[PDB]
Design a protein around this nucleic acid. Structure first.
Ligand code: CA
Ligand code: CA
Ligand code: CA
Ligand code: CA
Lengths: 338, 338
DNA sequence: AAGTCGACCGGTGGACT
DNA sequence: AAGTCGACCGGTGGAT
């Protein structure tokens, strides 16, 4: 559970344990001895808890503590079973903690979207936990989908075919000149729900926890929307970075720039909103770095001039992340006709 | 020395050793037991050796083994003095190996600059080791300085005050709109030598090795040129990354775009040349990534659009690194009037 | 399927203050 | 100084 429990831990099938012993089944080219079972850790720690939508204690708890809990539980489990034999590289904890930060945060936003969408289709404003009711006029056309995007994703694949074609022919021409304009992906995209889906309950249901079925539901969602999103319907891009270093700031800054060049410059979309979330900015310089103007618009006679990255957000609690996303939708979705 | 020597290691004062035992003098908040003394490692391994300018075997050796030598030498010393107690985090090796790659490569380029400059002032082409003789007409005005740039550096500070003022005025306008366009730094910049310095011999002197005094000379050089470089005289920027990961590509790509926007767009400089060096690209993805057209080149839509990053270079040997740099200077310096 | 590729970030040694 | 600030990259768990 969220709070570690030996009983709960003993009740776990060997393959459900947070630590997997691979001392006898090594990974080729790797001297790894114990693996952090990331999916098992999410199921154990957050199987019945989505922070911000759980007990008032968890919702208002320091988000750093919430995010660090799965690894802590895992290390507690490994220590119990293997004592002094238990060993995991720093880089194992780094990789997993990053994924925990992203996945959990995306789940928080997923439930935000569910509650938002329910309101949009004319139901009430669910009251527990308590968040401020949006002032925006409800409409099914103002629903959104929260899409955790996979490694190796190209965000262009979200767009309707005709918009993809504009981009493809733009690049094709660049190539015959020895140039390219590859696109990677933000960690997450919030998109206006396609009309086709605007009465599917899927997008209006809050999940109770990151059980395996729910992990899969959230991580697979983007597939349902590929080739269905209009350029202006990419409402928000988010890059999660649990901590920052000066050299690890530039991927979201660059991708934001490319998204803006393509969507605003080539496809006539409004300002593309792209933000970065972190738990540990390690100084004030990352904030300055993210004050940078989007480059394309700096050329005369191009698109609107604005920041590439709208904000570097440091969520103090899960409840604050939820509050901020609701407030964002309240503003951004006003641009969408009811 | 380059080849480990038990004797030479004995001759070392303990403060000169490559492995510092801090088991009883811990770093505050750290459980580090042994430290990788990086500057000591450079003096021990390269004190009398600049690869590409040393013995034939070292010049032609796999550059990976050359750059990997200081850490290998360090581990040997550690295992000697401390046996099974000797241990270092992979993150210590990562940090040190990265610095070695950059510093050694920069030293190679420094000696290249020295030889080029000697040629430019009419002293002929130093023949040992033997590299192809540049064909470009010699001129004191075509001398260059290789500047290993420091942490927290802003490349704009290299520029003559008049050019710095142009950039500040541009940013002033941006700050009025809540925007900005900060500049960081490449690892290294090659700049045309200011006329004021074109008969100073330090710039034509090849160093014998990375003794501590020579480390300081190379690492301090940029201070001598600050506020003296013309915008069009920033001739090459280099970013060193010993290995690549997909998320670690974007700082040079982004910074190159900004350099192009400011130097080419605001200051009328010729094409800004910015390259990335690595020993381990880990696939072909990075090469594709670095084929990207300049964002502000696309923004301007002039007759010629060029890449932000000119090349991703994987040096096979220190001699190739030297050869490539000489050939680059032979072409680029043609843009400077004799 | 399971394997080959994606992308995750934290502990480090040195310069500056 | 010892404390604070930059920027280095390598080992990881899993997804058509
Ligand atoms: Ca993801
Ligand atoms: Ca991320
Ligand atoms: Ca540097
Ligand atoms: Ca570098």
């Amino acid at each position: 559970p969220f709070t570690y429990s030996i009983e709960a831990t003993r009740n776990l099938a060997t393959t459900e344990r947070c630590i997997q012993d691979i001392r006898n089944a090594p990974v080729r080219n790797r001297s790894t001895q114990f693996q952090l079972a990331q999916q098992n850790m999410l199921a154990y720690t957050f199987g019945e808890v989505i922070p911000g939508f759980a007990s008032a204690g968890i919702n208002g708890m320091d988000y750093r503590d919430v995010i660090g809990r799965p690894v802590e539980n895992a290390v507690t489990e490994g220590t119990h079973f293997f004592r002094d034999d238990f060993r995991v590289d720093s880089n194992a904890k780094a990789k997993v903690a990053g994924d925990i930060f992203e996945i959990v945060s995306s789940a928080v936003m997923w439930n935000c979207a569910a509650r938002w969408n329910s309101l949009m289709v004319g139901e009430g404003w669910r009251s527990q936990p308590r968040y401020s009711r949006p002032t925006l006029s409800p409409s099914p056309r103002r629903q959104v989908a929260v899409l955790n995007l996979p490694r190796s994703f190209d965000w262009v694949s979200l767009l309707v075919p005709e918009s993809q074609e504009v981009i493809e022919e733009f690049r094709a021409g660049l190539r015959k000149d020895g140039l390219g304009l590859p696109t990677s992906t933000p960690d997450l995209a919030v998109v206006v729900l396609p009309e086709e889906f605007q009465n599917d309950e899927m997008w209006r249901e809050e999940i109770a926890g990151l059980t395996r079925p729910n992990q899969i539901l959230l991580s697979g969602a983007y597939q349902r929307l590929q080739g269905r999103v209009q350029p202006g319907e990419i409402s928000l891009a988010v890059a999660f970075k649990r901590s920052l270093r000066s050299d690890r700031l530039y991927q979201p800054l660059y991708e934001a720039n490319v998204m803006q060049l393509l969507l605003e410059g080539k496809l006539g979309a409004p300002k593309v909103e792209f933000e970065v979330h972190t738990l540990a900015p390690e100084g004030t310089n990352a904030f300055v770095t993210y004050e940078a103007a989007s480059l394309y618009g700096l050329a005369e006679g191009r698109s609107a001039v604005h920041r590439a990255i709208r904000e570097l957000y440091v969520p103090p609690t899960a409840a604050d992340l939820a509050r901020r996303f609701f407030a964002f939708l309240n503003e951004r979705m006003e641009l969408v006709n009811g």
